[PDB]
């Protein structure tokens, strides 16, 4: 499954995500993982403001709210779902064409945890501790390895 790691400074992640979404076909189903330090609301509400049909899950909300969001997503009415890792525990993501790691996690095991056609991950200096582990994995999947990612693992 195509894994693309792109260098994206923090202040550029929102504009980079907009372009990744503007290229989505009919907006196939896209799952966007965000760090809880930012929260899924910040990204969902920015997407809404920007005119996108999207929705979010959180781990502290009612099952009624979760299931309404998940149905909007699954049925393609809100084909973008924002989630933290905790919130997406147990999530059946077998119908998701595109996973976007807006924030990468601390450890490569969580990354491994997250019909999947593409995983795009945003990377910058805050993610240095996972460079070699992410490197090793991309080699295993016979995946494109950016030159700069090896020179940073060094």
């Amino acid at each position: 499954i195509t894994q693309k790691v792109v260098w994206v400074e923090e202040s550029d992640k929102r504009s980079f995500l907009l372009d990744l979404l503007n290229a989505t076909g009919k907006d196939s189903l896209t799952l966007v993982f965000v760090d809880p330090k930012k929260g899924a609301d910040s990204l969902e509400d920015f997407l809404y403001h920007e005119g996108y049909a999207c929705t979010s899950i959180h781990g502290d909300r009612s099952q009624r709210d979760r299931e309404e969001a998940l149905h909007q997503f699954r049925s393609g009415k809100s084909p973008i779902l924002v989630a933290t890792a905790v919130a997406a525990r147990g999530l059946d993501i077998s119908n998701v064409k595109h996973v976007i790691n807006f924030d990468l996690p601390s450890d490569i095991e969580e990354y491994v945890h997250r019909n999947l056609g593409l995983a795009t991950s945003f990377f910058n200096e805050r993610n240095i501790n996972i460079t070699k582990d992410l490197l090793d994995l991309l080699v295993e999947a016979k995946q494109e390895v950016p030159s700069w990612l090896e020179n940073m693992a060094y």
């Binding site: 792109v6 994206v8 550029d12 980079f16 950016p146 940073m152």
Partner: protein
């Protein structure tokens, strides 16, 4: 590394650089042709280079170049670029485009530095595409004058000259690349140039680039590789004519852009 702080001077370089160059401008014709800008929140035009703060390195290089009053294109384009607003400029070669984009781009590279990725095969911070060796070299020489005493090392590559030595010159370091489009695609296919950190993109004489058949190469470099998308990179497109194909390239490549017309 402070990128805003001039490196020590070299007499030989000043002699090579600041004697015997030309601006590529026709001041007689173009000082007296008005420029108009249109778009949302268009920054106001300047009257002097001093009206924006381009920093120590550019102001000294401006003095060594003996540049004085900006042309009208420069008066309108420099604040636009300095605000990081995308630009579509219907403006002729000879109206003052080159400095209009090089001064604020270089200025911004100096006050921002290379970025965290570079601070850690060649990954230019700025790319300028040109239709011909002659314009590419014109632009490269202007870049050399305004990167004097800076960490920015400009390079130029073009077709009809030998890829081997261009490669060997790139390997010596490249922060701003001027290129003709087919030669850059060769360099990309050979793994010599990466576009992951290209934050300033200029297409000069875009109408001629299209007319000479470079639109496939341009879409590959800009849309189908690792160049940051619009809204992330800052993009400037210059063209003396504004046919449908340039309007399409403008709509595809530029984000929320100011339109500038000479005349």
């Amino acid at each position: 590394d402070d990128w805003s702080k001039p490196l020590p001077p070299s007499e030989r370089l000043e002699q090579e650089l600041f004697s015997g160059g030309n601006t590529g401008i026709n001041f007689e014709k173009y000082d007296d042709i008005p420029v108009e800008a249109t778009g949302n929140n268009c920054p106001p035009h300047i009257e002097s280079f001093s009206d924006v703060e381009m920093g120590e390195i550019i102001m000294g290089n401006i003095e060594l170049t003996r540049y004085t009053r900006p042309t009208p294109v420069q008066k309108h384009a420099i604040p636009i670029i300095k605000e990081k607003r995308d630009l579509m400029a219907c403006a002729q070669t000879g109206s003052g485009k080159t400095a209009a984009f090089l001064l604020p781009i270089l200025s911004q590279i100096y006050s921002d530095g290379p970025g965290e990725a570079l601070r850690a095969k060649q990954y230019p911070i700025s790319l300028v595409l040109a239709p011909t060796r002659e314009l590419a070299v014109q632009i490269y020489e202007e870049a050399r004058k305004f990167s004097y005493r800076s960490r920015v090392r400009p390079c130029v590559v073009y077709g009809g000259a030998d890829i081997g030595q261009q490669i060997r010159d790139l390997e010596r370091g490249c922060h701003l690349l001027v290129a003709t489009p087919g030669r850059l695609v060769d360099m990309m296919e050979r793994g010599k140039i990466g576009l992951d950190f290209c934050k300033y993109l200029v297409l000069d004489e875009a109408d001629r680039m299209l007319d000479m058949g470079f639109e496939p190469q341009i879409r590959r470099i800009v849309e189908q590789d690792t160049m940051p998308p619009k809204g992330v990179r800052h993009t400037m497109m210059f063209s003396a004519t504004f046919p449908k194909e340039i309007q399409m390239l403008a709509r595809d490549f530029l984000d929320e852009y100011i339109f500038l017309a000479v005349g």
